[PDB]
Design a protein around this motif. Structure first.
Motif, PDB file in Angstrom:
ATOM      1  N   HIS G   3       0.615  -0.999   0.151  1.00  0.00           N
ATOM      2  CA  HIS G   3       0.261  -0.058   0.116  1.00  0.00           C
ATOM      3  C   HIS G   3       0.595   1.026  -0.201  1.00  0.00           C
ATOM      4  CE1 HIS G   3       0.803  -0.231   3.803  1.00  0.00           C
ATOM      5  NE2 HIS G   3       0.683   0.617   4.023  1.00  0.00           N
ATOM      6  N   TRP G   4       2.372   1.448   0.588  1.00  0.00           N
ATOM      7  CA  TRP G   4       2.607   2.169   0.423  1.00  0.00           C
ATOM      8  C   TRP G   4       3.096   2.829  -1.229  1.00  0.00           C
ATOM      9  CZ3 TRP G   4       4.562  -1.606   3.868  1.00  0.00           C
ATOM     10  CH2 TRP G   4       5.404  -2.425   3.463  1.00  0.00           C
ATOM     11  N   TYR G   5       3.272   1.714  -1.716  1.00  0.00           N
ATOM     12  CA  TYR G   5       3.204   2.223  -2.924  1.00  0.00           C
ATOM     13  C   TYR G   5       2.730   2.921  -4.145  1.00  0.00           C
ATOM     14  CZ  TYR G   5       7.749  -1.096  -2.713  1.00  0.00           C
ATOM     15  OH  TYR G   5       9.507  -1.537  -2.769  1.00  0.00           O
ATOM     16  N   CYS G   6       3.449   4.047  -4.446  1.00  0.00           N
ATOM     17  CA  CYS G   6       2.699   4.623  -5.318  1.00  0.00           C
ATOM     18  C   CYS G   6       1.577   4.964  -5.330  1.00  0.00           C
ATOM     19  CB  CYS G   6       2.526   3.661  -6.922  1.00  0.00           C
ATOM     20  SG  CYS G   6       4.490   2.928  -7.647  1.00  0.00           S
ATOM     21  N   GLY G   7       1.023   5.540  -3.950  1.00  0.00           N
ATOM     22  CA  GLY G   7      -0.411   6.315  -3.532  1.00  0.00           C
ATOM     23  C   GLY G   7      -0.876   5.864  -2.594  1.00  0.00           C
ATOM     24  N   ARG G  13      -1.214   1.957  -8.814  1.00  0.00           N
ATOM     25  CA  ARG G  13      -0.071   0.756  -9.052  1.00  0.00           C
ATOM     26  C   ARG G  13       0.095   0.976 -10.194  1.00  0.00           C
ATOM     27  NH1 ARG G  13       4.222  -1.636  -8.812  1.00  0.00           N
ATOM     28  NH2 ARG G  13       4.871  -3.262  -6.682  1.00  0.00           N
TER      29      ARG G  13
END
Ligand SMILES: [Mg+2]
Ligand SMILES: [Mg+2]
Ligand SMILES: [Mg+2]
Ligand SMILES: [Mg+2]
Ligand SMILES: [Mg+2]
Lengths: 49, 26, 62, 47, 219, 101, 36, 83, 107, 51, 145, 49
Positions: G3-7, G13
């Motif tokens: 969830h921390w990746y790309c928004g 994502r």
RNA sequence: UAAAUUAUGGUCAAUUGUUAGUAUUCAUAUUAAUUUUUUUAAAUGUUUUAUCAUUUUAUAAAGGUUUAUUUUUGAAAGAUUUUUUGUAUAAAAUUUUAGGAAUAGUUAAUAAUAAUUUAUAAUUUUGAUUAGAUUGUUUUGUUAAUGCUAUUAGAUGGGUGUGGAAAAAUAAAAAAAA
RNA sequence: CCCACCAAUUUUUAUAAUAAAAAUAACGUGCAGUAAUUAAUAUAUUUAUAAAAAUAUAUU
């Protein structure tokens, strides 16, 4: 200046910097008062008769 | 539906606010 | 057997009637090996068993 | 007889040529939830 | 003095009789011209059996050789069915499926190397009754097989499910296809073209320990 | 794998290849997991071992003499630190458990 | 998908992965359409 | 995963009491649920949040430990004080 | 002269040179000037050195002094790296400010 | 896990150096020259006291 | 049992360093991103950083890897990877230099497809024989510039 | 370059070589010239010694 | 439009449990991990010498690096001697960011080590440079999975030009000339 | 069943004299869909303390 450009490749086909559409007669109609007619004839797109 | 109607209403409100701002600038 | 059910596309995923209907439809759409062999013209045992004489059953009769 | 053509006008698309570009066909790539396997994720379907 | 023959049409010497058009069909015109070149002085005509240009191209099967005649150049342009964005195998599978869902007797499919190989494999496995105009180099008719109402073919799917991605199958992949879902699978047939332009199924592929590029599956 | 790795292609499916690359990927490359025959020797060292390149062992009457599998409670990992085990390198690591059992 | 990746949503994502797609048309569109 | 914004990944947060008041729960539920204002400094930056005060009213507490909740009754708060 | 020699590694230019052939595209004026001005500049420099001894001696002494006093005269790995700003790009900005860019060519 | 497994009889019946396929390892001409000179030097190394 | 290449790699790791890196690195750790700039005023003109970024070259998802099997491998027997190349001349502005654009293959295991990427090289021509548009074969050599 | 056309290019190259041999043939042997030296060698630069 | 050829003169099935290997519980996970009732243990004086000297004692400063960093070598090994003994450095592919644009002690040639010259130079929308994040190349977790999710391979210009080779001023289980 | 402002707290982006969005059971204004009171919708334009409409086309 199209006749004596200070850069090479005046036009480009990028995604966000397309300037070929911005070279048609409709855009020069706004500044037609200061327009050079020879420059318009030699460098313009979709010119009318 | 009502979602699109509310979207249109919000757009119309934004447009009238912009025109009011232009009148204030005048 | 192994059964996998996906009811995400349905409007109400939590539908036991949807679950049972899907399982029964999948069971109904199943052909037995005997039916498949009868339709193909083959021996049912020469479709799921690894015996080398069965290799002659997948060729063309010449 | 005569060919009064101009490569500069042809490349600069004077007179407004049009090419009818492709639409969603090139853009669409499908769901990338998993890996691309042969016969797809669900080979065969009965409705 | 050398004129380069660019393209398969120019290599095969298409007349290009149609004015200013090179992509026009010419097989009918060539066939009629060969018919004219035929001789009606003992002048034995040529039978309607499909022929080959070279005597060495006759089939090795003595029974099959009876159905082929050695014609010098009239053997070309054979067939009556014409050609019926996507791969030929994808089109073939789509035609077969949409005709077996309509309970038709014959389906005209384009005759490519892989298409006719897959047709022969399905015939060997008993999923197709027979063929019509099989020697045709453009299209041929697959005769569908029906038993007690429902069709023999249940599901037929090409390997390129989207029609734009090809896959290479290793011998491990072929053996996994054979033992799919923990059982010995001679039921579902996976067809692959080997590196030797030879179309076989997964049983033969695992028997001779090879692989190939997959084409389609049918059961 | 590239440098220092003998793996030359994906195990099961690959993008289309051309010519000798396709020939090697489909027929010629070594395949350890093949149970019928081991990777064949170059000619002429293959015709003389024709009868020995079939199957694994001719017995088929083997009586398993090892410990029985633990069905319950079915432990997952056995990473026991040992003192005299010289195969600890092979023992460590994730391995697929699929056999007769 | 972390969830921390790309928004925070899945479409972010998805588009970030799409901008690395092998096809040139899809990569170019995925990296230019929102900047448009 | 927009929830637990002020946790900053940690399973719990160390906050200090500043204010305490009450808020009505979302309709059709009615009442006066007690919520406290909390302040904490993380990496030389002060942060202010609102958390549900479910801890017993015993000792005079100045700090609190905050965990995640999940009760959709109070619009604006999702943090709960550990007992 | 269009093919290199695989055995010796010679390029097509070397093969043409050994065979006495000539594969030179029609040169433009700028290319002719490039190939022609080398001799002119060499003659100019030699004439200057033979005509003004004191000035040439002073210039050569100053050039040698700066070369000898340079901080990186030693030919270690860092000096022997063909592209210092690209290879040692960790140093740029924080320690070395000579190059404002870490990339100058197609490498 | 893999308590009792067996391998093909060919593995124990094979002769020595019968698995080495002939592969053509091509090199640069300069590498060929360097290697040939090194091998020649090693061959011509004198048998004084240590060789 | 037949041991996969992971076992051999672990063997090499154990030989070089006592034991292998089997420590159960906590991949579930909550990575966080604390913003420091304005909503749209990120200090860069090209790309804006607003979340945790991927790290590593060969650990990027989706995976990209070299694909040696291409036209160069079909034609030439390369002593080393990328020793021989074939391309088209795309510039002769520099004296005694020819710029050549070549193609290589990048493999995407997730999508199971390969793409042809382009790279430019400064090939050397001594006698000025290369003209733009020439299909040339180029080879590695010593450092020239 | 696209690798799918390698077989077609091999066929065309074979045909071109065969036509060259058939028509041009070989107009007499040519004396072999002594090969020169190549500047372009592999590896790192060598010392002037 | 080939027209029903005729000793039907051999039927007696199948199963003996034996194998060419990714197989799917929508999640409550007999999955992994952090989090509650407070886990321990080893140290700090290298040695030798011809005596205010000389000889032998060489990457864990960590920084913030995505076209990136790659290297043992004249010492030692080492042998009844050259005469130093002795080709180490260089390439290819893979390289992050919601709101994407210009970069520059610059490219090549050179009778030019240490460029007073010549050129229509080089980088980049096939995504450059700057800025942010982050120690690069099957090692962790999980799944039916070529998916997703981890990871100190601890690596580099002004401090002495010594040394074969700087890495040389915390440590890190190490035998250093009887 | 049911729309916009006003009133009333407040929350985020922002600290620029900014600006904008959004959450909200009882107010005050105007009248807004649900074959529903009016063919419908969209675009563009115009008026009123800023609600409601009008005007002009296109679509079905
Ligand atoms: Mg988070
Ligand atoms: Mg940085
Ligand atoms: Mg690189
Ligand atoms: Mg020595
Ligand atoms: Mg980049």
């Amino acid at each position: 200046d199209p006749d004596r450009p200070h850069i090479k490749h005046i036009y480009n086909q990028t995604a966000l910097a397309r300037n070929l559409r911005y070279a048609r007669y409709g855009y020069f109609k706004r500044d037609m008062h200061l327009l050079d007619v020879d420059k318009l004839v030699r460098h313009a797109r979709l010119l009318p008769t | 539906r009502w979602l699109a109607r509310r979207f249109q209403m919000k757009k119309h409100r934004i447009i009238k606010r912009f025109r009011f701002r232009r009148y204030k600038l005048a | 057997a192994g059964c996998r059910i996906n009811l995400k596309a349905t409007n109400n995923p939590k539908s036991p009637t949807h679950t049972v209907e899907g399982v029964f439809e999948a069971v109904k759409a199943l052909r037995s090996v005997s039916e498949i062999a009868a339709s193909r013209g083959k021996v049912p045992h020469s479709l799921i068993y690894n015996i080398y004489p069965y290799l002659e059953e997948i060729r063309r009769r010449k | 007889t005569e060919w009064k053509l101009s490569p500069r006008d042809i490349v600069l698309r004077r007179f407004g040529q049009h090419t009818k570009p492709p639409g969603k066909a090139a853009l669409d790539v499908g769901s990338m939830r998993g890996s691309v396997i042969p016969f797809g994720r669900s080979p065969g379907e009965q409705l | 003095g050398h004129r380069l023959l660019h393209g398969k049409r120019e290599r095969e010497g298409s007349l290009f009789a149609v004015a200013n058009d090179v992509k026009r069909d010419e097989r009918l015109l060539r066939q009629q011209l060969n018919a004219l070149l035929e001789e009606e002085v003992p002048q034995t005509p040529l039978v309607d059996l499909p022929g080959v240009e070279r005597r060495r191209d006759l089939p090795a099967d003595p029974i099959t050789r009876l159905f082929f005649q050695h014609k010098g150049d009239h053997a070309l342009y054979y067939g009556t069915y014409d050609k019926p964005l996507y791969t030929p195998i994808y089109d073939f599978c789509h035609r077969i499926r949409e005709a077996t869902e309509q309970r038709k007797r014959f389906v005209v499919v384009p005759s490519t190397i892989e298409t006719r190989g897959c047709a022969r494999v399905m015939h060997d496995h008993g999923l197709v009754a027979g063929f019509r105009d099989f020697h045709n180099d453009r299209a041929f008719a697959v005769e569908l097989k029906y038993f007690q109402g429902d069709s023999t073919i249940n599901v037929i799917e090409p390997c390129s499910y989207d029609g734009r991605t090809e896959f290479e199958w290793s011998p491990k992949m072929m053996r996994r296809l054979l033992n799919t879902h923990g059982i010995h699978n001679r039921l579902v047939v996976y067809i692959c073209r080997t590196a030797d332009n030879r179309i076989i199924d997964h049983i033969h592929a695992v028997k001779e320990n090879i692989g190939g590029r997959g084409l389609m599956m049918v059961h | 794998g590239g440098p220092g790795s003998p793996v030359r292609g994906p195990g099961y499916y690959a993008p289309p290849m051309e010519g000798e690359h396709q020939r090697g990927y489909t027929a010629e490359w070594r395949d350890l997991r093949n149970p019928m025959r081991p990777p064949e020797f170059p000619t002429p060292w293959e015709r003389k071992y024709r009868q020995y390149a079939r199957g694994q062992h001719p017995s088929y009457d083997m009586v398993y003499a090892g410990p029985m599998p633990e069905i319950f409670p079915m432990r997952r990992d056995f990473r026991k630190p040992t003192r005299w085990d010289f195969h600890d390198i092979e023992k460590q690591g994730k391995y697929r458990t699929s056999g007769p059992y | 998908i972390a969830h921390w990746y790309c928004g925070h949503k899945f479409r972010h994502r998805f588009m970030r992965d799409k901008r690395f797609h092998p096809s040139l048309q899809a990569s170019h569109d995925a990296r230019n359409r929102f900047s448009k | 995963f927009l929830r637990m914004w002020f946790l900053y990944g940690c399973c719990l947060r160390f906050v200090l009491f500043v204010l305490c008041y009450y808020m009505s729960p979302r309709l059709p539920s009615s009442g006066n649920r007690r919520v406290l204002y909390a302040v904490f400094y993380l990496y030389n930056f002060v942060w202010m949040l609102r958390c549900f005060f479910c801890c017993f009213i015993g000792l005079v507490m100045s700090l609190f430990i905050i965990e995640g909740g999940g009760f959709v009754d109070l619009p604006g708060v999702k943090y709960y004080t550990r007992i | 002269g269009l093919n290199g020699c695989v055995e010796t590694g010679r390029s097509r230019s070397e093969v043409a040179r050994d065979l006495g052939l000539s594969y030179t595209r029609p040169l433009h004026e700028n290319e002719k000037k490039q190939l022609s001005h080398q001799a002119v500049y060499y003659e100019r420099l030699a004439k200057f050195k033979m005509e003004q001894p004191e000035a040439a001696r002073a210039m050569e002494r100053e050039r040698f002094v700066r070369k000898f006093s340079g901080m990186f005269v030693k030919m270690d790995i860092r000096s022997g790296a063909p592209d210092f700003p690209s290879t040692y790009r960790r140093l740029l900005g924080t320690k070395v400010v000579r190059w404002a860019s870490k990339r100058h060519g197609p490498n | 896990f893999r308590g009792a497994d067996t391998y093909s009889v060919k593995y124990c019946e094979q002769g020595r150096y019968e698995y080495q396929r002939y592969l053509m390892i091509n090199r640069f001409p300069s590498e060929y020259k360097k290697h040939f000179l090194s091998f020649l030097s090693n061959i011509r190394m004198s048998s004084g006291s240590a060789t | 049992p037949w041991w996969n290449f992971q076992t051999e790699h672990r063997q090499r790791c154990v030989l070089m360093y006592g034991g292998a890196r089997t420590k159960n690195t906590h991949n579930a750790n909550h990575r966080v991103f604390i913003k420091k700039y304005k909503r749209n005023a990120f200090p860069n003109r090209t790309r804006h950083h607003w979340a945790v970024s991927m790290t590593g070259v060969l650990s990027q998802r989706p995976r990209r890897m070299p694909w040696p099997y291409d036209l160069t491998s079909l034609i030439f027997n390369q002593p080393r990877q990328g020793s021989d190349k074939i391309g088209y001349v795309v510039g002769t502005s520099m004296l005694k230099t020819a710029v050549v654009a070549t193609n290589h293959m990048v493999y995407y295991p997730k999508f199971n497809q390969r793409v042809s990427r382009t790279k430019r090289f400064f090939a050397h021509d001594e006698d000025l024989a290369c003209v733009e548009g020439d299909l040339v074969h180029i080879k590695q050599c010593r450092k020239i510039s | 370059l696209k690798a799918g056309l390698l077989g077609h290019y091999q066929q065309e190259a074979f045909e071109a070589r065969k036509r060259f041999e058939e028509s041009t043939t070989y107009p007499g042997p040519i004396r072999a010239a002594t090969p020169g030296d190549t500047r372009f060698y592999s590896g790192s630069l060598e010392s002037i010694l």
